[model samples]
Target chain A: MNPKILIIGACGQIGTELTQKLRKLYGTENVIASDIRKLNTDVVNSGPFEVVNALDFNQIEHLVEVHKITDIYLMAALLSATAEKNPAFAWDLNMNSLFHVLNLAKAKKIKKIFWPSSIAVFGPTTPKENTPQYTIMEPSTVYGISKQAGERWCEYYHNIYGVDVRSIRYPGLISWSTPPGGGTTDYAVDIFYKAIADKKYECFLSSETKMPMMYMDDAIDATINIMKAPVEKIKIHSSYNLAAMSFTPTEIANEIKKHIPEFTITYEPDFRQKIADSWPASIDDSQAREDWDWKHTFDLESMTKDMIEHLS
Target chain B: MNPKILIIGACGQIGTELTQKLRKLYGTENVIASDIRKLNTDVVNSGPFEVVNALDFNQIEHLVEVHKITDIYLMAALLSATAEKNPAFAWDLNMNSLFHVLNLAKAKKIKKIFWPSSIAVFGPTTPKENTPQYTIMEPSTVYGISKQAGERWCEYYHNIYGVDVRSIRYPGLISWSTPPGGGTTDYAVDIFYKAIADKKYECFLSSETKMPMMYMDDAIDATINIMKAPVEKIKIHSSYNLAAMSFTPTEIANEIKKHIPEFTITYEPDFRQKIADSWPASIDDSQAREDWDWKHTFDLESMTKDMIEHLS
Candidate 1:
């Protein structure tokens, strides 16, 4: 069944691609894509669009009511590296937006919800290899802290109020459609753009730093699939651990060399190196796979191939 | 070191005692006890007092400046059982208050901070026995979630901004001077009150639900000592798991029987039973012990005796 959708932050990194994917799959008229003033663009023209401040509960509620929305994909958040720049603002926006949406669902104004958690929820203390669905989550960054707490609230609403909220703890997402907002894992997306432009890139994180990452298509599929799955089939109200692959900058740089013969990468690790270090090198998403038959379609090799194809 | 102190929420359970203790120890004039409004009471008349809204940053900052306050004991929070009834109000009060204080420290407006974390930060998903300081903390309550986020932010401020902030993850506290606020573990304190009044008590939890608890003096000691410890020795930036003794209603009732043989106890499990069930039966506070020479003076026997002697 194709549900009427409202995609918040439809102008963001994941939001941009996710909006298009949902529009194409669910019919353009069925999906209402919205964000902070991305006026008269392809996203706005391709589907019904609106301006919304995610922090304004009134605006989001009105839109939800006016659109006759059944589901909401809350893609608005201040990501890892960027969030650290404005901790209070980030915490407030990241937390209050979710609260409004969750409260909306609690009031029975909407039926289902999709919020994104991130691998940032784990920190240096977490088991770095194949971080489990549930483990020690002492996130070190402001972004990570908000996410960790956000996940708890999500699960709380589900258990206490019986709200149907589905979420995924997406890793560093890579895409060719839009520039991945520069975060701890944006180097993966950044590497591709740089490789095609100048055949060389300077990484903000060390060449050897490994992190959990996924292609945009896989992330979109998981988001929609989990929302589409029967309520019984959807477990883990806090968010599912999601992974397509894990790689170091060196590995991805080496992979890029396959397409561009002269591709070169130099390490110039900055403050983001510590942020990356605090996160998991890999994640165990077996719960997602078992619960909803989630199988990611793109790996590092294939994802790189597709990116080069689209960009070139 | 005679540190000029501002004890916020001076009218609260912990704050009431802590203010008096700090006044006697650091001199009455130096410790300014404050809350929403208790203008002419003992807490207000015993020393300098100011009415403060914990959410008002400007008011707190003004006090910090006028009093030349070197240390702040932020005791304003919605305790576990109380918070469940009002999640939004509780979350806002608990979080924003901490943010205001933490931001003050970040700006060097205050020299040091003592914010209390709680055992409520742990959930059912956590290891239920001898819960380690660094473990799974998927707290199931709004109060717990706020404390969890507060602890992370405390550590974050200390790490990123070098703010001198100290904290302890206090367990359920028992006191003679103040009534326990009917939290999940208040049955321990309530048993004493009911034993003296009616010779019988009804508990909201099962007979076998063991929980970590500390006498008021021990808790105040731990709170003050951790704050007084050398900053270098305070290695755990987030919060130290400060534990004392653990017992069930059966064990506590048995201990009470030693004083009042006529005292009888009955179980009438309620909503708080589930809240208590999610918390750790015992906590491994070895880190607090090893780091700061933390040692509790009262066991169940001594604490119960003291409570009875004071009440009877």
Candidate 2:
């Protein structure tokens, strides 16, 4: 049996729910939660939580040694939208943190690793629909560029050093556990929150602009499924393209109005729209589906229903 | 008449000949030749020369401002074989120096810029024959990786800030003015020297390893010609694939043997062979041809003849 697993960035949207589900599977004591900052009171007191800077190699190593950590889920990163505002910092933080964690695994300090890539890895030149697993990925944003380079290095370490690292090119992830982080598809999560709180939302993207999205439950399931799969079954060492649904802001708002009745959405496109524009409307994940039996359960309607129900 | 121009790597193999050619066009005083080390006395005294580290931005800026520099040809970089010996230093020097020059242009300090890329941008996954303008470029060596990233940034700067930076993806350059830099293709230059000096040379690549090569004069002509072409005609914002000749060591040695029947060559392949194996055997530069009327003037036999003549 695996020992305690550590979840970095545990307070973030995916990390929060992922930590809870991990605790449910393994005992609460077997799953440790950590973030750079003090997480929510619920997360801090839920189980064993620690304050660890993902960039600090020594601190991460110390925690792993003390807790006898068997696996590490590196979810800490400056996402696409925020990274563009400050490229130099984003590049340094995003890249250096991954290196610190990957180097730890390289030294056999951890047995397994799970890092996330994003659909933002696709750029203007990439296929608009059914973006292939491998294509012209010269990302315009700092976050996307970092992830692209990071994916290459991950494959390099896996091939050369035999490190058991796994990854998924996750789309915009929607969750009820926590707010979305810095990302172009953040409107997907924001719309849900505004629908419940104020009954109206101002979207940061145009009506026809489409992007791949996933409900929190599907994302969590996919994460655990990929991590649990045998190493032999996994083909893409860089990252698997994991997908669920694709929709525009207007489409999602209309879906929300089906439940909320009076909910309204206004388009007030911002800098994030450019980031979204560069990304693909959808992705082809045949490789992920074939390898590890990867499957997504949530469609837009179902995901919206679950989101509004949980929030209500 | 145009104001003075400065070449930062004037003591380098390409720089030595480039300075002479430029001096012929622009007066000797107008074309300032600067390198970290001194150049040949004739070339040094023929033109204005300065000892400047290309990495030091302030010194570079000072020289440009002092000279009222109108154009810059940045040619200083750690070559492949040398960069392999010291990865971090090579990356720092290659990336930082380019950044310095590009930043100067971005700041409106320089009117025109010419930075060089290499066929090192292509790798094993890239199609060996007629590598396209855009294809799978997973560079294996440190030098190659740096060049690949540099090309992306060049295109980025051009698109975003509208910096008029032109570049060329130079193949294995064969020059007789000065010795070739420490590179995988240094064997091509050394083969000729050995043919004349020892009449026999131990080649660093296998006999069958054919790579893209260019006579130094053709490379210089291509470089200068592209820079002179109108901005609209020069479509590729990244670098143009500029090719001249492609040949194997045996083919070149055999050609040399035609002139000097006693000349012989032997193969003692080194680590550079791996680097050579990863590069494109030829490049498809249709864009360069269409954009700026790029044409090559030297083949294997002609290049060998020119080198032997220049040496004798």
Candidate 3:
């Protein structure tokens, strides 16, 4: 059977762009995009699409068998802001889905898996700046706690079952293709939209709060690149720290002002500000860089420009 | 209208003893001993025993309402060696049962909780000598992972929902009331039984491998003490590091020699040896001492003396 690719959350922020990229690389016929809801027309109409619920293990197993999927990019998860509202549901969704996919890999039904962890995995007790790959990760929020446990299970399945599971602890991701989902960092994407649509935006976080973030292109590139790398080169089965930029809301607003001089931003700091405050301002991805030759191509300035160009 | 106490896993090792003590204090009718299985003759004859599965939320709620339970001692869990053998089942049993109890507490169905953590929560990365209340805990075993996660949930419940849940990181507990369940530390209890029955024991851990341990009475005393203390005084919400004596197999054998001069010991270390090696030799439980006035009443010599005397 031909080695095919399946994207579990093709409609999500990362999934939408990632699916398109995977289709380009793997050929539209070889890359199957699936989600509970319909994705962008380009992804759905141009390639193979399926509406698959991640929690149903048997459904996923049948999908894999029918499609002859060899690799799966499990991008399905409940984001931070949304998770806080329904912790138990979020925990079950985030954890049970990962387990389903990982178990599939364990059974050799799938050959490889790509699951994403986040900076949310780190909490208030963790070192606030230059957060090391291996350090105190006592995640306070429900989303963060679930991810922390998810990372452990990923490593566990990989170590014990010899499943080829790869993961990255992505910081706040800034993408233009799809608006950020229900994440604490959704403000980063929203600010760009509001900056273009209206000359000003009300930020959900304070101006001085700095947090690790990355351009979507860099995130997708790292995701694909690491998954392509040989097994030996990809150390840290739990998750690798993947960082591109760390910026405050004011810092990002200033970047947007570079493109549109009339742009202004105001802070209305919500519950998510507390969530963002608990996360690290920056991360040390030295291990990822050394192990998988990870390198980010975009800074805040470059990423802002790219986002504006795509959105405008 | 007095407070009703519900003990989940009332048939297990600590639960059996704890049930007896609580039943005596609260009266047999007020303290409800519930387990998935029917209780032994002692627990059943002493107090109200119910067949309630920890995983079933509705059943647990039903039991809580029927008994008008205000305080819950959630002792149901899959121990170390057993969890390793069935990681998923162990994770389910260890985590889900806590969630059920915490959720019940969150809903104001219960007023307080008593959960047990273990020395197994420490891992290879953790310091092996006098492990502090908070340290690097990257538990290598499935049981340890679940316990660590359980501790986090306990803290989460306390912080988020204002649920009063008390916990202790019990060391290798030495008890004669009931046989030690499937845990890495079972060798300690098994040795006593073998010494009385055969006057010789095949040790499952190396003669020199020292691990944190405590007599059952001291453990029960610490458990009850913590539960009785004011909530404000209990600082560490996750669990308290508990210790009595650290001893190697040879040390225990030498102690046994005092009772049975010719008692023979043989080294046939099994999978549990690796688990014991990863745990701390001693524990720093100053927080337990300062908060609840926790003190151990027995050491290796005294415990051995009591066990020999009781068995004879």
Off by over 4 Å in 3: none
Chain A only, candidate 3, TM-score: 0.98
| iRMSD of prediction 2 | 2.1
Error of 2 at A257 (Å): 3.1
Number of the top-ranking candidate, with DockQ as the measure: 1
Question: Which candidate wins on lDDT?
Answer: 1
Query: lDDT at B90 for candidate 3?
Result: 94
lDDT score, candidate 1 = 0.91
Q: Which ten residues in a row have the lowest lDDT in candidate 2 chain B?
A: B38-47
C-alpha RMSD between model 1 and the true structure = 1.2
- For candidate 2, write residues A1-312 as lDDT tens digits: 855799989988889899999988888989999999894667778999999998888989999999999899999999998987777688778878888888888899898999999998777878889887766766777788788767766775686578888999999999877888878888898898888999999988999998998888988998898898898987888888888999888889999989989999889999888889889999899999999888999999998888888888
TM-score, model 2 to reference: 0.91
How many pairs in model 3 have backbone atoms within 3 A of each other, for residues 3 or more apart or on separate chains, i.e. clashes? 0
How do the residues B234-284 of candidate 3 rate in per-residue lDDT, one tens digit apiece? 988888998899999999999998888879999998888877877888899
Q: What tens-digit string does per-residue lDDT give for candidate 3 at A267-310?
A: 99999988998899999999999999999999988888888999
Per-model RMSD to reference? 1.2, 2.9, 1.9
TM-score per candidate, in order? 0.98, 0.91, 0.96
